[PDB]
Design an enzyme around this catalytic site. Structure first.
Site: not given
Ligand SMILES: O=C(O)c1cccc(-c2ccc3ncccc3c2)c1
Ligand SMILES: [Cl-]
Length: 242
Positions: A47, A95, A227, A50
């Protein structure tokens, strides 16, 4: 010149994590990192892609402005915040992959490829699906390459209009107070090994800018908050933020 500060590894080790943090002092043109090798290792942008996607969509007119609404397609996905309408600001904040997959299809391979070459972004290889190459395709980018790209965006030196670059930098706004402003973008790559998290951006001060890019092993979604946590511990240690 670049300096390696392995003391930062303590912030990764404390959470039984592995990763890299890269910083760039704009005023002094000096970089710092805990791991020179991983700082130059290329990963899927996920992401964080983006940022260029937004820039290209705006400059080509795929996105009119930061208010244009992109309607939810009604298909329920397991991320709650994705099941609603968005604009450029909220799609970036949350995102929202499917919104940006639609941006990519309207851009098209040929224009996408030409634009990323003009940006000198990563390996410039969109081989794969035009709408998902940043998630499971062939484009790769390292932390130091992220910084070089971000530095061009900050100075409005990318080969798109100044307007497009101002709008995207607005959309990257993450945190601001009396001490600093952070413009950044998170990333989470899970479809190809190794699974990792990204955080890339910069810290604006009264009289300097600190660019940063970090990635870290992310075997489970449970460590995503790390992060930002680890990056801020590094920023605190270096007296960049209070
Ligand atoms: O941090 C991003 O930039 C991002 C971008 C796309 C998807 C996710 C994501 C996906 C599954 C998760 N499942 C559980 C908890 C959080 C989750 C976050 C994060
Ligand atoms: Cl702003």
């Amino acid at each position: 010149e670049w300096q390696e500060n392995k003391s930062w590894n303590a912030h990764f080790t404390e959470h039984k994590s592995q990763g890299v943090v890269v910083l760039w002092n704009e005023n002094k043109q000096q970089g710092f990192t805990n791991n020179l090798k991983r700082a130059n290792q290329a990963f899927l942008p996920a992401s964080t892609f983006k940022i260029p996607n937004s820039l290209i969509a705006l400059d080509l007119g795929v996105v009119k402005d930061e208010h244009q609404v992109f309607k939810w397609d009604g298909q329920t996905r397991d991320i709650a915040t994705w099941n609603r309408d968005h604009n450029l600001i909220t799609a970036m904040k949350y995102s929202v992959v499917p919104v940006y997959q639609e941006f990519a299809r309207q851009i098209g391979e040929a224009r996408m490829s030409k634009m990323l070459h003009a940006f000198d972004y990563g390996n410039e290889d969109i081989s794969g699906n035009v709408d998902s190459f940043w998630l499971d395709g062939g484009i790769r980018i390292s932390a130091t390459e992220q910084i070089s790209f971000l530095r061009k965006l900050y100075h409005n030196k990318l080969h798109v209009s100044e307007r497009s670059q101002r709008i995207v930098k607005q959309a990257m706004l993450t945190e601001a107070n009396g001490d600093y402003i952070i413009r950044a973008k998170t990333g989470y790559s899970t479809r190809i090994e190794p699974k990792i998290g990204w955080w890339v951006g910069w810290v604006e001060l009264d009289d300097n800018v600190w660019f940063f890019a970090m990635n870290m092993d992310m075997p489970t979604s449970d460590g995503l908050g790390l992060r930002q946590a680890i990056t801020k511990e590094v920023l605190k240690q270096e007296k960049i933020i209070p």
